[PDB]
Design a protein around this ligand. Sequence first.
Ligand code: SF4
Ligand code: F3S
Length: 106
Amino acid sequence: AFVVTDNCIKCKYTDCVEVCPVDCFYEGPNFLVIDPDECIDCALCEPECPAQAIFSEDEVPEDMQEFIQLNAELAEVWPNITEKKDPLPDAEDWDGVKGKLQHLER
Ligand code: SF4
Ligand code: F3S
């Protein structure tokens, strides 16, 4: 599975959904997650994230380990997203800010 980690929060560019062959991205107010059961690990989405927020599960930084189980849980409750949309309004003011998990919205 590939995993979306911290820098997606309040950026949510959605460039990643274009390239997904299986449509396994699920949409929240200010973040996207990958459903781990659906993901086929094609790795096509991770060059496409402008925030460089996507990682192979086995490469998730030590300090972002929580995001693996978070993707799995929120994928069960959030709606599937299959079309790119516009980035959140202030997405590049927040791109690269560390510690954005405290801003996640359900
Ligand atoms: S690795 Fe492939 S299947 Fe998995 S979320 Fe990314 S593009 Fe979709
Ligand atoms: S910022 Fe998030 S919405 Fe997709 S393109 Fe990157 S994982």
